[PDB]
Amino acid sequence: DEETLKKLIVRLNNVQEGKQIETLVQILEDLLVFTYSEHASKLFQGKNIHVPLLIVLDSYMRVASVQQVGWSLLCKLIEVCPGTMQSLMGGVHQLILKMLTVHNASVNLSVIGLKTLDLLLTSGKITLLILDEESDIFMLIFDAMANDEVQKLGCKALHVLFERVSEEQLTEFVENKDYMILLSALTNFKDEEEIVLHVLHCLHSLAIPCNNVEVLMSGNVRCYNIVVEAMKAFPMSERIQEVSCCLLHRLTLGNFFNILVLNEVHEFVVKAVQQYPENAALQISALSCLALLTETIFLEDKLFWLEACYKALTWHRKNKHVQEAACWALNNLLMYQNSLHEKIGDEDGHFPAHREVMLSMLMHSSSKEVFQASANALSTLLEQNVNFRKILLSKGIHLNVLELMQKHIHSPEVAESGCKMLNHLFEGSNTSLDIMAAVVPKILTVMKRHETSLPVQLEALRAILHFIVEFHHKLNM
Amino acid sequence: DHLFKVLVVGDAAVGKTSLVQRYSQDSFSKHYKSTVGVDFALKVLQWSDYEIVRLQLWDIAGLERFAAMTRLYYRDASACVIMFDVTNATTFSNSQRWKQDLDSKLTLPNGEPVPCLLLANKCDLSPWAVSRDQIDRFSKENGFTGWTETSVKENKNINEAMRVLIEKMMRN
Ligand SMILES: Nc1nc2c(ncn2[C@@H]2O[C@H](COP(=O)(O)OP(=O)(O)NP(=O)(O)O)[C@H](O)[C@H]2O)c(=O)[nH]1
Ligand SMILES: [Mg+2]
């Protein structure tokens, strides 16, 4: 048992004959891959088992045997020994990059090296060492790409290398790297779900710089490939749809007038939010993307959007971002489509999105963005349908938002949205003296605190205008 | 003037809205319905001269009792109340669960527990109606601020109990 392993590792330190050491390493690798016990993981974790092997492989590069089986041996050891990654750091990256550099031009030698690199990069804190080497790891992997395992491992790798290459590094990459992947694999492995996932999220990672959108939209290649992947590759895959959706969200800008493609992606977005409504995975990205694209497109679907937004609020009350994006989408939809004003409400067959929006506002007072979006949404809703007036008033909205603007005062946008919402809420109604005393001083103080901002002044003046006009004695006070 | 928030919690189908409609919308009895989500009501009380208080009643839906009772509802809240129907001991165990949950996930600026009141709903129904002797055990064991019988349809003691609870709340 362990006595034979001790003899093998002792003989491994001799480094006498390359062929004999190769056969011994092969025998040790064959014996180590078993489910009998953790004898190979005897907690020693001695580098003397594998450091001389990699030293021999690097120095004697012509020895293909040690290259072929030493990588498999270390892969098996890492997959078996739990603390092998802990033994890696606290180097080996330089050794593996030299292995990939000098003589890994063969398919068999390349695939094992890329697999070992992929499993090593799952540990963390070693990517910085990999990116600060001298072997040009990005150039190495670019030169590596044409076999399926190579590709599925070319990606699942790179995926982490794009985390901090540099916005500039991505910019250098956009010139030539896109072809070595998008052209190289999306077409080639059109039938490889994991490869498609890795390629799509690598596109996500490289899409961070703003200048590269024009490069990505050179011939609408990004939009077409992602739409085709969403349509065909993944009818019922959550990860693919989520990644493609995040690409959609990050690829919305002043060039949004991709009319036909607009319609296409809009449909795909609907499909996404209708087929996986259980996590932030799709909801936030799609709703924000959808809101902008719906504004552009509108210049049925609206009912589906209302339902999707209602479940978005319902199932993710704890996340500020989800609610913000969903209520913003509801606002932007209701702005361009007013026919559904009666289609929403407390009555049966209509989504009660009012109480949900109010609950969102109360439960996330600390964020100005959620207040801004939800306030604009329910203000537009109140302007659309007159029936909702005096119902929220009876529900406790006025003094509540007054206290909220009292809490949030350092920003002008929040004050402007609050004043606009008060204007559209209190229109066409008559209040009492108590409401006057509870409303006018607070809004006057808010207007004083933000005197320079023109929209805040306009909205405040409009609200005061619509709101200003025994009993005589009280009114005098 | 001041504003405050009160959270009404309890078991399912106990007529939570009935009480909140009776105290604010002046709607009592009526049809028995299921509360899908959290609903709101406003109350204005002229407790003292030049001192008018506003109350926001949040009637938490008890259908998803097994679901995690998020602290966001109790966040910034100033008062709470547990109301259970008197025709089921399961409602009594549920009220104990609500008490434990609020004691675990509610905080005050002074750190003391916020006032709580045990509402014995619709006592105007046979047979377990005036079993105050059994209720007194939990009344003194749980350390509740108050306990009071009530009937949503008849509104026999909603007003006095609410006045006592709000007076206790401003007493802190
Ligand atoms: N037996 C009896 N039933 C009453 C009395 N008063 C009201 N009810 C009935 O009880 C019903 C309770 O329905 P509802 O208020 O909608 O229940 P809810 O508790 O708000 N639903 P949820 O638990 O989700 O909040 C209605 O109030 C009425 O039909 C009463 O004095 N006796
Ligand atoms: Mg109810």
Side-chain angles (χ1 to χ4, degrees), chain A residues 270 272-277 280-294 296-297 299:
Chain A
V270 184
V273 289
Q274 295 201 340
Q275 81 174 78
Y276 282 108
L282 267 308
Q283 319 288 68
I284 170 183
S285 308
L287 294 174
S288 155
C289 166
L290 172 164
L292 322 156
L293 295 175
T294 182
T296 287
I297 189 50
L299 159 72

PDB file of all heavy atoms in Angstrom, chain A residues 270-299, unseen atoms left out:
ATOM      1  N   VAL A 270     -39.286  39.378 -24.084  1.00  0.00           N
ATOM      2  CA  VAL A 270     -40.576  38.919 -23.567  1.00  0.00           C
ATOM      3  C   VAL A 270     -40.506  37.430 -23.262  1.00  0.00           C
ATOM      4  O   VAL A 270     -40.947  36.978 -22.198  1.00  0.00           O
ATOM      5  CB  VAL A 270     -41.709  39.227 -24.562  1.00  0.00           C
ATOM      6  CG1 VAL A 270     -43.053  38.825 -23.971  1.00  0.00           C
ATOM      7  CG2 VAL A 270     -41.723  40.686 -24.918  1.00  0.00           C
ATOM      8  N   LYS A 271     -39.998  36.645 -24.221  1.00  0.00           N
ATOM      9  CA  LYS A 271     -39.864  35.200 -24.033  1.00  0.00           C
ATOM     10  C   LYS A 271     -39.108  34.896 -22.745  1.00  0.00           C
ATOM     11  O   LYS A 271     -39.514  34.043 -21.942  1.00  0.00           O
ATOM     12  CB  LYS A 271     -39.158  34.578 -25.239  1.00  0.00           C
ATOM     13  N   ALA A 272     -37.980  35.589 -22.560  1.00  0.00           N
ATOM     14  CA  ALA A 272     -37.130  35.413 -21.387  1.00  0.00           C
ATOM     15  C   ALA A 272     -37.900  35.663 -20.096  1.00  0.00           C
ATOM     16  O   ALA A 272     -37.898  34.825 -19.187  1.00  0.00           O
ATOM     17  CB  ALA A 272     -35.919  36.337 -21.480  1.00  0.00           C
ATOM     18  N   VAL A 273     -38.559  36.823 -19.994  1.00  0.00           N
ATOM     19  CA  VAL A 273     -39.228  37.162 -18.737  1.00  0.00           C
ATOM     20  C   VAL A 273     -40.461  36.298 -18.519  1.00  0.00           C
ATOM     21  O   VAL A 273     -40.941  36.181 -17.385  1.00  0.00           O
ATOM     22  CB  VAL A 273     -39.604  38.654 -18.657  1.00  0.00           C
ATOM     23  CG1 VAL A 273     -38.360  39.503 -18.500  1.00  0.00           C
ATOM     24  CG2 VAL A 273     -40.414  39.085 -19.861  1.00  0.00           C
ATOM     25  N   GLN A 274     -40.981  35.685 -19.578  1.00  0.00           N
ATOM     26  CA  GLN A 274     -42.114  34.777 -19.472  1.00  0.00           C
ATOM     27  C   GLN A 274     -41.697  33.349 -19.161  1.00  0.00           C
ATOM     28  O   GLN A 274     -42.548  32.550 -18.758  1.00  0.00           O
ATOM     29  CB  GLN A 274     -42.976  34.802 -20.740  1.00  0.00           C
ATOM     30  CG  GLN A 274     -43.673  36.129 -21.001  1.00  0.00           C
ATOM     31  CD  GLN A 274     -44.863  35.985 -21.929  1.00  0.00           C
ATOM     32  OE1 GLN A 274     -44.971  35.011 -22.673  1.00  0.00           O
ATOM     33  NE2 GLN A 274     -45.763  36.957 -21.890  1.00  0.00           N
ATOM     34  N   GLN A 275     -40.419  33.002 -19.339  1.00  0.00           N
ATOM     35  CA  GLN A 275     -40.006  31.625 -19.121  1.00  0.00           C
ATOM     36  C   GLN A 275     -39.097  31.401 -17.917  1.00  0.00           C
ATOM     37  O   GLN A 275     -38.835  30.237 -17.592  1.00  0.00           O
ATOM     38  CB  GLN A 275     -39.327  31.085 -20.390  1.00  0.00           C
ATOM     39  CG  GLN A 275     -37.875  31.492 -20.564  1.00  0.00           C
ATOM     40  CD  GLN A 275     -37.225  30.819 -21.758  1.00  0.00           C
ATOM     41  OE1 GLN A 275     -37.440  31.223 -22.902  1.00  0.00           O
ATOM     42  NE2 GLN A 275     -36.433  29.786 -21.501  1.00  0.00           N
ATOM     43  N   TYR A 276     -38.623  32.443 -17.230  1.00  0.00           N
ATOM     44  CA  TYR A 276     -37.851  32.257 -15.995  1.00  0.00           C
ATOM     45  C   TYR A 276     -38.018  33.456 -15.072  1.00  0.00           C
ATOM     46  O   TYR A 276     -37.160  34.346 -15.009  1.00  0.00           O
ATOM     47  CB  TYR A 276     -36.363  32.043 -16.294  1.00  0.00           C
ATOM     48  CG  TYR A 276     -35.985  30.657 -16.766  1.00  0.00           C
ATOM     49  CD1 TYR A 276     -35.619  30.429 -18.085  1.00  0.00           C
ATOM     50  CD2 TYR A 276     -35.965  29.582 -15.887  1.00  0.00           C
ATOM     51  CE1 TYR A 276     -35.265  29.168 -18.521  1.00  0.00           C
ATOM     52  CE2 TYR A 276     -35.609  28.315 -16.313  1.00  0.00           C
ATOM     53  CZ  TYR A 276     -35.259  28.115 -17.632  1.00  0.00           C
ATOM     54  OH  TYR A 276     -34.904  26.859 -18.067  1.00  0.00           O
ATOM     55  N   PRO A 277     -39.124  33.511 -14.329  1.00  0.00           N
ATOM     56  CA  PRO A 277     -39.395  34.669 -13.469  1.00  0.00           C
ATOM     57  C   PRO A 277     -38.942  34.490 -12.024  1.00  0.00           C
ATOM     58  O   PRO A 277     -39.468  35.184 -11.150  1.00  0.00           O
ATOM     59  CB  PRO A 277     -40.915  34.793 -13.566  1.00  0.00           C
ATOM     60  CG  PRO A 277     -41.357  33.339 -13.566  1.00  0.00           C
ATOM     61  CD  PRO A 277     -40.216  32.526 -14.229  1.00  0.00           C
ATOM     62  N   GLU A 278     -37.991  33.604 -11.729  1.00  0.00           N
ATOM     63  CA  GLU A 278     -37.688  33.320 -10.328  1.00  0.00           C
ATOM     64  C   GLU A 278     -36.452  33.991  -9.731  1.00  0.00           C
ATOM     65  O   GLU A 278     -36.319  33.982  -8.502  1.00  0.00           O
ATOM     66  CB  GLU A 278     -37.550  31.803 -10.133  1.00  0.00           C
ATOM     67  N   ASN A 279     -35.549  34.573 -10.515  1.00  0.00           N
ATOM     68  CA  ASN A 279     -34.428  35.277  -9.900  1.00  0.00           C
ATOM     69  C   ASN A 279     -34.034  36.498 -10.715  1.00  0.00           C
ATOM     70  O   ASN A 279     -34.467  36.682 -11.857  1.00  0.00           O
ATOM     71  CB  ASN A 279     -33.213  34.344  -9.726  1.00  0.00           C
ATOM     72  N   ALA A 280     -33.174  37.329 -10.108  1.00  0.00           N
ATOM     73  CA  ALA A 280     -32.565  38.502 -10.740  1.00  0.00           C
ATOM     74  C   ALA A 280     -31.827  38.163 -12.037  1.00  0.00           C
ATOM     75  O   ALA A 280     -31.410  39.063 -12.774  1.00  0.00           O
ATOM     76  CB  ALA A 280     -31.612  39.191  -9.760  1.00  0.00           C
ATOM     77  N   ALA A 281     -31.630  36.860 -12.272  1.00  0.00           N
ATOM     78  CA  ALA A 281     -30.974  36.292 -13.446  1.00  0.00           C
ATOM     79  C   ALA A 281     -31.393  36.963 -14.747  1.00  0.00           C
ATOM     80  O   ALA A 281     -30.553  37.333 -15.572  1.00  0.00           O
ATOM     81  CB  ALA A 281     -31.250  34.786 -13.510  1.00  0.00           C
ATOM     82  N   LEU A 282     -32.696  37.140 -14.937  1.00  0.00           N
ATOM     83  CA  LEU A 282     -33.200  37.828 -16.111  1.00  0.00           C
ATOM     84  C   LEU A 282     -33.964  39.111 -15.822  1.00  0.00           C
ATOM     85  O   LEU A 282     -33.886  40.035 -16.636  1.00  0.00           O
ATOM     86  CB  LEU A 282     -34.175  36.886 -16.838  1.00  0.00           C
ATOM     87  CG  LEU A 282     -33.847  35.912 -17.970  1.00  0.00           C
ATOM     88  CD1 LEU A 282     -33.123  36.560 -19.100  1.00  0.00           C
ATOM     89  CD2 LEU A 282     -33.052  34.731 -17.428  1.00  0.00           C
ATOM     90  N   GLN A 283     -34.711  39.182 -14.712  1.00  0.00           N
ATOM     91  CA  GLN A 283     -35.675  40.265 -14.504  1.00  0.00           C
ATOM     92  C   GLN A 283     -35.074  41.665 -14.635  1.00  0.00           C
ATOM     93  O   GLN A 283     -35.565  42.476 -15.422  1.00  0.00           O
ATOM     94  CB  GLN A 283     -36.355  40.114 -13.143  1.00  0.00           C
ATOM     95  CG  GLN A 283     -36.727  38.699 -12.752  1.00  0.00           C
ATOM     96  CD  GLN A 283     -37.900  38.139 -13.539  1.00  0.00           C
ATOM     97  OE1 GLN A 283     -37.806  37.894 -14.742  1.00  0.00           O
ATOM     98  NE2 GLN A 283     -39.021  37.945 -12.856  1.00  0.00           N
ATOM     99  N   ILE A 284     -33.982  41.954 -13.916  1.00  0.00           N
ATOM    100  CA  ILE A 284     -33.522  43.343 -13.850  1.00  0.00           C
ATOM    101  C   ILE A 284     -33.006  43.815 -15.205  1.00  0.00           C
ATOM    102  O   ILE A 284     -33.393  44.892 -15.701  1.00  0.00           O
ATOM    103  CB  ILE A 284     -32.459  43.495 -12.745  1.00  0.00           C
ATOM    104  CG1 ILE A 284     -31.792  44.871 -12.829  1.00  0.00           C
ATOM    105  CG2 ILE A 284     -31.444  42.349 -12.777  1.00  0.00           C
ATOM    106  CD1 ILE A 284     -30.693  45.075 -11.818  1.00  0.00           C
ATOM    107  N   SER A 285     -32.180  42.986 -15.852  1.00  0.00           N
ATOM    108  CA  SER A 285     -31.560  43.390 -17.102  1.00  0.00           C
ATOM    109  C   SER A 285     -32.631  43.556 -18.162  1.00  0.00           C
ATOM    110  O   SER A 285     -32.647  44.558 -18.891  1.00  0.00           O
ATOM    111  CB  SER A 285     -30.510  42.371 -17.533  1.00  0.00           C
ATOM    112  OG  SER A 285     -29.592  42.113 -16.487  1.00  0.00           O
ATOM    113  N   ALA A 286     -33.556  42.588 -18.230  1.00  0.00           N
ATOM    114  CA  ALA A 286     -34.546  42.630 -19.288  1.00  0.00           C
ATOM    115  C   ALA A 286     -35.471  43.806 -19.080  1.00  0.00           C
ATOM    116  O   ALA A 286     -35.877  44.440 -20.049  1.00  0.00           O
ATOM    117  CB  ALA A 286     -35.343  41.329 -19.331  1.00  0.00           C
ATOM    118  N   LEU A 287     -35.882  44.068 -17.834  1.00  0.00           N
ATOM    119  CA  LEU A 287     -36.834  45.154 -17.629  1.00  0.00           C
ATOM    120  C   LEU A 287     -36.217  46.497 -18.001  1.00  0.00           C
ATOM    121  O   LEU A 287     -36.875  47.316 -18.651  1.00  0.00           O
ATOM    122  CB  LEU A 287     -37.392  45.137 -16.209  1.00  0.00           C
ATOM    123  CG  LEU A 287     -38.234  43.877 -15.991  1.00  0.00           C
ATOM    124  CD1 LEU A 287     -38.686  43.738 -14.556  1.00  0.00           C
ATOM    125  CD2 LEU A 287     -39.434  43.873 -16.927  1.00  0.00           C
ATOM    126  N   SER A 288     -34.955  46.752 -17.598  1.00  0.00           N
ATOM    127  CA  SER A 288     -34.353  48.036 -17.973  1.00  0.00           C
ATOM    128  C   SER A 288     -34.200  48.139 -19.489  1.00  0.00           C
ATOM    129  O   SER A 288     -34.551  49.169 -20.104  1.00  0.00           O
ATOM    130  CB  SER A 288     -33.001  48.207 -17.282  1.00  0.00           C
ATOM    131  OG  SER A 288     -32.159  49.086 -18.008  1.00  0.00           O
ATOM    132  N   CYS A 289     -33.749  47.035 -20.110  1.00  0.00           N
ATOM    133  CA  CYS A 289     -33.498  47.027 -21.543  1.00  0.00           C
ATOM    134  C   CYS A 289     -34.817  47.244 -22.254  1.00  0.00           C
ATOM    135  O   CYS A 289     -34.917  48.025 -23.208  1.00  0.00           O
ATOM    136  CB  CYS A 289     -32.837  45.704 -21.929  1.00  0.00           C
ATOM    137  SG  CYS A 289     -32.773  45.301 -23.667  1.00  0.00           S
ATOM    138  N   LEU A 290     -35.844  46.552 -21.760  1.00  0.00           N
ATOM    139  CA  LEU A 290     -37.167  46.545 -22.348  1.00  0.00           C
ATOM    140  C   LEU A 290     -37.747  47.940 -22.273  1.00  0.00           C
ATOM    141  O   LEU A 290     -38.414  48.374 -23.204  1.00  0.00           O
ATOM    142  CB  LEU A 290     -38.047  45.503 -21.638  1.00  0.00           C
ATOM    143  CG  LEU A 290     -39.559  45.289 -21.830  1.00  0.00           C
ATOM    144  CD1 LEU A 290     -39.914  43.939 -21.242  1.00  0.00           C
ATOM    145  CD2 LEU A 290     -40.434  46.345 -21.172  1.00  0.00           C
ATOM    146  N   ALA A 291     -37.591  48.608 -21.122  1.00  0.00           N
ATOM    147  CA  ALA A 291     -38.135  49.951 -20.946  1.00  0.00           C
ATOM    148  C   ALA A 291     -37.565  50.901 -21.987  1.00  0.00           C
ATOM    149  O   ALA A 291     -38.311  51.634 -22.662  1.00  0.00           O
ATOM    150  CB  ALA A 291     -37.826  50.462 -19.541  1.00  0.00           C
ATOM    151  N   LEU A 292     -36.237  50.885 -22.166  1.00  0.00           N
ATOM    152  CA  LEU A 292     -35.725  51.823 -23.163  1.00  0.00           C
ATOM    153  C   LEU A 292     -36.201  51.416 -24.555  1.00  0.00           C
ATOM    154  O   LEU A 292     -36.647  52.266 -25.352  1.00  0.00           O
ATOM    155  CB  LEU A 292     -34.201  51.901 -23.098  1.00  0.00           C
ATOM    156  CG  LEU A 292     -33.581  51.844 -21.703  1.00  0.00           C
ATOM    157  CD1 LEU A 292     -32.139  51.345 -21.770  1.00  0.00           C
ATOM    158  CD2 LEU A 292     -33.643  53.209 -21.036  1.00  0.00           C
ATOM    159  N   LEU A 293     -36.095  50.119 -24.872  1.00  0.00           N
ATOM    160  CA  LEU A 293     -36.437  49.698 -26.216  1.00  0.00           C
ATOM    161  C   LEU A 293     -37.928  49.855 -26.490  1.00  0.00           C
ATOM    162  O   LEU A 293     -38.309  50.047 -27.644  1.00  0.00           O
ATOM    163  CB  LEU A 293     -35.985  48.264 -26.477  1.00  0.00           C
ATOM    164  CG  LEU A 293     -34.469  48.071 -26.453  1.00  0.00           C
ATOM    165  CD1 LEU A 293     -34.144  46.597 -26.596  1.00  0.00           C
ATOM    166  CD2 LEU A 293     -33.742  48.912 -27.488  1.00  0.00           C
ATOM    167  N   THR A 294     -38.785  49.794 -25.456  1.00  0.00           N
ATOM    168  CA  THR A 294     -40.215  49.974 -25.685  1.00  0.00           C
ATOM    169  C   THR A 294     -40.499  51.422 -26.012  1.00  0.00           C
ATOM    170  O   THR A 294     -41.362  51.716 -26.855  1.00  0.00           O
ATOM    171  CB  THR A 294     -41.114  49.473 -24.540  1.00  0.00           C
ATOM    172  OG1 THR A 294     -42.479  49.683 -24.929  1.00  0.00           O
ATOM    173  CG2 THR A 294     -40.951  50.228 -23.250  1.00  0.00           C
ATOM    174  N   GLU A 295     -39.815  52.340 -25.315  1.00  0.00           N
ATOM    175  CA  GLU A 295     -39.953  53.739 -25.678  1.00  0.00           C
ATOM    176  C   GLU A 295     -39.617  53.914 -27.152  1.00  0.00           C
ATOM    177  O   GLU A 295     -40.370  54.546 -27.902  1.00  0.00           O
ATOM    178  CB  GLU A 295     -39.046  54.601 -24.802  1.00  0.00           C
ATOM    179  N   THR A 296     -38.462  53.387 -27.577  1.00  0.00           N
ATOM    180  CA  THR A 296     -38.065  53.593 -28.970  1.00  0.00           C
ATOM    181  C   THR A 296     -39.019  52.901 -29.959  1.00  0.00           C
ATOM    182  O   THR A 296     -39.361  53.471 -31.002  1.00  0.00           O
ATOM    183  CB  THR A 296     -36.626  53.106 -29.164  1.00  0.00           C
ATOM    184  OG1 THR A 296     -35.727  54.026 -28.533  1.00  0.00           O
ATOM    185  CG2 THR A 296     -36.256  53.007 -30.637  1.00  0.00           C
ATOM    186  N   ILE A 297     -39.492  51.689 -29.623  1.00  0.00           N
ATOM    187  CA  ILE A 297     -40.316  50.883 -30.535  1.00  0.00           C
ATOM    188  C   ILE A 297     -41.717  51.472 -30.728  1.00  0.00           C
ATOM    189  O   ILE A 297     -42.247  51.480 -31.846  1.00  0.00           O
ATOM    190  CB  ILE A 297     -40.355  49.391 -30.124  1.00  0.00           C
ATOM    191  CG1 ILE A 297     -41.026  48.547 -31.212  1.00  0.00           C
ATOM    192  CG2 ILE A 297     -41.188  49.134 -28.911  1.00  0.00           C
ATOM    193  CD1 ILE A 297     -40.489  48.782 -32.615  1.00  0.00           C
ATOM    194  N   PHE A 298     -42.346  51.953 -29.645  1.00  0.00           N
ATOM    195  CA  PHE A 298     -43.749  52.364 -29.720  1.00  0.00           C
ATOM    196  C   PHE A 298     -43.964  53.563 -30.632  1.00  0.00           C
ATOM    197  O   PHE A 298     -44.992  53.639 -31.316  1.00  0.00           O
ATOM    198  CB  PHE A 298     -44.276  52.666 -28.317  1.00  0.00           C
ATOM    199  N   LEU A 299     -43.046  54.524 -30.617  1.00  0.00           N
ATOM    200  CA  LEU A 299     -43.072  55.659 -31.540  1.00  0.00           C
ATOM    201  C   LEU A 299     -43.254  55.241 -33.005  1.00  0.00           C
ATOM    202  O   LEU A 299     -44.364  55.251 -33.542  1.00  0.00           O
ATOM    203  CB  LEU A 299     -41.788  56.474 -31.392  1.00  0.00           C
ATOM    204  CG  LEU A 299     -41.389  57.368 -32.563  1.00  0.00           C
ATOM    205  CD1 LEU A 299     -42.300  58.581 -32.666  1.00  0.00           C
ATOM    206  CD2 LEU A 299     -39.941  57.779 -32.409  1.00  0.00           C
TER     207      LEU A 299
END
